[PDB]
Write a protein that binds this DNA or RNA. Structure first.
Ligand SMILES: [Zn+2]
Ligand SMILES: [Zn+2]
Ligand SMILES: [Zn+2]
Lengths: 152, 280, 575
DNA sequence: GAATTCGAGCTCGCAACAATGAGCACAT
DNA sequence: ACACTGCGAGCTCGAATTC
């Protein structure tokens, strides 16, 4: 049992067994408690995907910076931004800063980079939960195959 | 019935006040309904007060001092349509400015702050959570009207100090939220009645046609008919038992024993508020 | 005499006075007896018919409850040509019953003396093969229902759903989140009258609860429902209105619209379309195994959305393919040309409830619409060629009128400054292009795509910058057009009073108000009074704006005659 | 009665698809 | 020992009117 067994017919194929129910469920809600969206193409109709060839060009790095800027002005109190890796988090944040994009995100929210070592990370996580509780709000930009993605 | 009130109105002046989704200027649609709000506040509450604070670029600047002047507020909100509104607001600097004056009011009143708040971020140089222990000690009642989202401070600032937090659906909901902030929640002052045109008895100073306080000697000058409308709520008239020739219109009271018709019976309790036989 | 606010005419016509103290207890009586013809604000006018009394005795009032309460609300005395008609059309209701049981159709009668009368007609002997019964063929159930009305022994489709013990009673339950308005509670009360479901047609506006009544009727019969629709967009709304108000999982709400196919074999609610169940060509293999499953299961409460397209030639064969006990029909505009709405009284049943379109406006359930038929004069260069030709080329001339181009550009500017959501409905797709590129506005041309149709429509709702949109014959159904505020209708189809009650459906979803641009002294003047003929029978008042509020002062197009001479050479070059 | 105009949905051929990163709980 | 998903063709209807 978990919460996100994504196809249920893969786990009896990898693990050599035969279940008897193999069921799925969905939670009931009094509202729409979640609003998933897939923000695809950019604001000037440019594709946004993180392929391996579509990472160097600044028509996509700007469209990631133009997204986190325009979501940090309409979302209250905390945004978690999972990147795909650590060398892509470095090569985008340090390429938002050389442009005029990371200057305008720090006006709205503080940003707390989740680094690999556990000493700086727990410092940057305790200040993140402090910044979401007082007025300013924060952005914890991290890595999807990381410590914060599974534990916190 | 109600009590005296010393309401402050904190108006947001951030970058996000240039936003759409409202009448031409988000700031302008705020100041439009505030001028409606000052009128209905002073009408139902005769001897109360209004201050108006505007927060802008990490600093709070007092737009109008705390006085019961129902003309000086509206003539200052018309000026502030052409405000710049640059930078990020504050909430420590704006609630402290609304605490250096509102703390020293006498304890028989209902001191209140009302924050109209459009930005999401309060960049302020200290901890907000020590004000909410201070404002709760000074019996202030801070209530926020939020725009476009729900912030965690504005929930814990409201529910700890004692006010309400509310977020706007649209402009028909924004007028409905400001309308609920005119009813007072359930001492002896000394005002000066301003007979003879409009002159002050204490300092004999002649000024404008106003229910305002007197600057030369500090006395408050109210008009006694305006105080008179708040009567008849206390000791109102008891209804009659009803089982031709009338006494009101001349074409049954348990006090004066004079019969009424049906038009007269509804008229006595609705508008006249006295029994026409009992005044004799 | 001053009371009793009716006038029973001797042929049959009931003039009810809507200013009487007993009007509310006489308007809740004539809905259960007669059908409305015209409803202005002062004197309503109902009408007795044969089918309207079969719906009367289907509810608990018998033939002596109607004919006595007409005398007590008469003002004239009943004229003895109605006592002979009410008694004739009420004692011949419950004699011949059409009931199905395990995939066989049966004509049943408790009185054997009418079966010996029924079995000499040579057309009912073609559809063959106490309690006297004989089995009839399923594929000749439409030609049977004409004959039982033809000899005044009409068939009733009263599903007795409380105890049948054959159908797998599913767990559809209406959750306490959707509270229904007091006109929706009156329509369902007339349907589920005696504790048994009844096959009728409920006429509610699309801005009203046209779909909440269909969900609440599905949670009431609690059998295997089947929702139909006119389009593939209309079934993704019916799927959303079942998840919103009925607590059904996604393993039971399926679809049959050739793209999803959410395992349609073995479900409880199937939401399909017309022209998929009646597709008369070689079907695909995924649709063939579903239609072999759907042709052999007795449903309950087929829900036929957009009922006014059922009397077509291909959409009425659906009702013989699918076997249902009771058939509810939900529509908004019951009027339709070619005179086939009276034909619909035996495909489904009697008309149950029509909502008073002015009572829903005075209570706030419907936006107060200010109709205004602004008509524009004709240009003197265009009228030179209008009277010279007769063969369909002049349809472009009264559509691409330059003086009508100014009144469209002025009304767009006048409501963009008030922050109003403008929809310009415009048929004759050549003039859709030449209107929407001279104002630089988006247009759903109709053969655009499925892709940019969905984002132009979404850039209209959640964006305060894009304000107008130029649809063309697409929004003539119950589509997801996102709550417009004005509607500048330009040069639609000929005399379709169904259309201008579906263009009106966008507005009420003054508060909101729609226009109707007419090029005067042409053939469109006669057309635009044929299409208000349905709306003046509901209470709506169409003003006339001969000259707009300062049209000549702004920067309007086609000012000079040199730029007007080029437009006629563009129109006349088509031929 | 037999076209038109413009919409609809259903099949179904057609052309060409893609997939880039980094570390502590558990047995003698 | 090549090839997923969108997307336009035909095909057959409907609504209302010309021809
Ligand atoms: Zn004085
Ligand atoms: Zn008295
Ligand atoms: Zn009297």
């Amino acid at each position: 049992t978990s919460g996100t067994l994504s196809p249920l017919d893969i786990y009896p194929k990898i693990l050599d067994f035969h279940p008897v129910t193999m069921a799925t469920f969905t939670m009931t809600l009094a509202r729409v408690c979640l609003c998933p969206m897939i923000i695809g193409r950019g604001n000037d109709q440019v594709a946004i995907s993180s392929k391996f060839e579509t990472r160097e060009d600044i028509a996509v790095i700007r469209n990631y910076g133009n997204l986190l800027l325009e979501m940090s002005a309409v979302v209250p109190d905390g945004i978690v931004a999972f990147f795909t890796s650590y060398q892509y988090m470095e090569s985008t944040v340090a390429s938002w800063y050389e442009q005029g994009i990371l200057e305008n995100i720090q006006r709205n929210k503080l940003l707390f980079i989740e680094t690999q070592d556990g000493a700086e990370t727990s410092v940057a996580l305790e200040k993140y939960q402090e910044a979401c509780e007082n007025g300013r709000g924060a952005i914890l930009l991290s890595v999807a195959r990381g410590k914060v993605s599974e534990g916190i | 019935l109600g009590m005296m009130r010393h309401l402050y109105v904190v108006v947001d002046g951030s970058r996000t006040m240039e936003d759409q989704d409202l009448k031409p200027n988000r700031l302008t649609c705020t100041l439009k309904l505030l001028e409606y709000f000052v009128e209905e506040y002073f009408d139902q509450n005769p001897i109360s007060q209004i201050g108006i604070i505007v927060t802008k670029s990490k600093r709070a600047e007092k737009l109008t001092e705390l006085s019961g002047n129902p003309r000086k507020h509206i003539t200052s909100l018309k000026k502030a349509v052409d405000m710049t509104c640059h930078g990020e607001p504050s909430l420590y600097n704006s609630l402290s400015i609304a605490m250096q004056t509102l703390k020293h009011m006498p304890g028989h009143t209902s001191r209140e702050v009302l924050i109209i708040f459009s930005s999401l971020t309060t960049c302020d140089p200290s901890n907000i959570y020590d004000l909410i222990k201070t404002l709760k000690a000074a019996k202030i009642r801070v209530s926020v009207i939020g725009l476009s989202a729900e912030v965690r401070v504005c929930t814990v600032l409201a529910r700890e100090t004692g006010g309400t937090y509310h977020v706007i659906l649209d402009e028909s909901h924004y007028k409905e939220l400001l309308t609920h902030h005119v009813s007072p929640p359930p001492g002896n002052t000394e005002p000066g009645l301003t007979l003879g045109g409009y002159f002050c008895p204490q300092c004999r100073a002649k000024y404008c046609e106003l229910p305002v306080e007197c600057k030369i000697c500090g006395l408050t000058l109210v008009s006694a008919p305006h105080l008179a409308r708040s009567y008849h709520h206390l000791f109102p008239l008891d209804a009659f038992q009803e089982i031709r020739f009338c006494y009101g219109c001349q074409g049954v009271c348990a006090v004066c024993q004079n019969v009424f018709c049906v038009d007269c019976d509804v008229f006595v309790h609705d508008s006249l508020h006295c029994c026409p036989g009992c005044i004799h | 005499h001053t009371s009793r606010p009716l006038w029973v005419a001797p042929d049959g016509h009931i003039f009810l006075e809507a200013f009487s103290p007993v009007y509310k207890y006489a308007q809740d009586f004539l809905v259960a007896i007669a059908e409305p013809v015209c409803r202005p604000t002062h004197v309503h006018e109902y009408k007795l018919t044969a089918y309207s009394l079969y719906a009367a005795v289907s509810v608990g009032l018998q033939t002596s409850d109607i004919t006595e309460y007409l005398r007590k609300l008469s003002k004239t005395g009943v004229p003895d040509g109605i006592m002979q008609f009410i008694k004739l059309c009420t004692v011949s209701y419950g004699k011949v019953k059409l009931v199905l049981k395990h995939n066989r159709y049966f004509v049943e009668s408790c009185h054997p003396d009418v079966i010996q009368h029924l079995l000499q007609d040579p057309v009912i002997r073609e559809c063959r093969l106490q309690t006297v019964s004989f089995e009839v063929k399923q594929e000749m159930i439409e030609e049977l229902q004409k004959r039982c009305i033809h000899l005044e022994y009409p068939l009733l489709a009263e599903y007795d759903f409380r105890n049948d013990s054959v159908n797998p009673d599913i767990n559809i339950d209406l959750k306490p989140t959707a509270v229904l308005r007091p006109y929706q509670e009156k329509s369902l009360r007339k349907m589920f009258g005696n504790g048994r479901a009844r096959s009728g047609v409920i006429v509610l506006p699309c801005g009203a609860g046209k779909s909440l009544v269909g969900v609440t009727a599905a949670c009431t019969v609690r059998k295997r429902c089947l929702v139909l629709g006119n389009s593939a967009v209309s079934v993704e709304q019916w799927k959303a209105q079942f998840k919103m108000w009925s607590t059904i999982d996604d393993s039971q709400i399926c679809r049959f619209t050739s793209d999803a196919k959410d395992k349609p074999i073995g479900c409880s609610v199937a939401i399909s379309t017309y022209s998929m169940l009646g597709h008369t060509t070689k079907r695909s293999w995924e649709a063939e195994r579903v239609m072999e499953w759907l042709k052999t299961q007795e449903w309950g409460l087929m829900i036929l959305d957009e009922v006014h397209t059922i009397p077509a030639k291909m959409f009425r064969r659906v009702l013989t393919i699918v076997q249902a006990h009771c058939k509810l029909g939900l529509t908004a505009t019951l009027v339709r040309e070619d005179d086939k709405i009276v034909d619909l009284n035996f495909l489904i049943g009697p008309k149950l409830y029509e909502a008073n379109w002015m009572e829903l406006q005075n209570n706030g359930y419907i936006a107060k619409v200010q109709c205004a038929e602004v008509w524009c004069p004709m240009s003197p260069e265009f009228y030179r060629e209008y009277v010279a030709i007769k063969t369909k080329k002049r349809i472009l001339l009264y559509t691409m009128n330059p003086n009508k181009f100014r009144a469209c550009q002025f009304l767009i500017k006048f409501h963009e400054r008030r922050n109003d959501k403008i929809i310009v409905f415009a048929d004759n797709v050549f003039a859709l292009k030449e209107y929407a590129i001279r104002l630089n506005k988006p247009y759903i041309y109709g053969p655009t795509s499925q892709g940019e149709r969905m984002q132009i429509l979404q850039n209209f709702k959640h964006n305060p910058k894009i304000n107008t949109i130029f649809i063309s014959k697409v929004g003539d159904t119950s589509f997801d057009l996102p709550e417009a505020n004005v509607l500048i209708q330009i040069s639609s189809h000929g005399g379709s009073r169904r259309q201008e009650a579906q263009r009106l459906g966008r507005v009420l979803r003054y508060n909101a108000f729609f226009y109707s641009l007419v090029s005067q002294d042409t053939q469109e003047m006669a057309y635009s009074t044929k299409r208000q003929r349905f709306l003046v029978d509901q209470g709506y008042s169409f003003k006339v704006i001969t000259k707009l509020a300062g049209m000549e002062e702004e920067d309007l197009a086609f000012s000079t005659k040199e730029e007007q001479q080029q437009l006629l050479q563009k129109v006349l070059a088509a031929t």
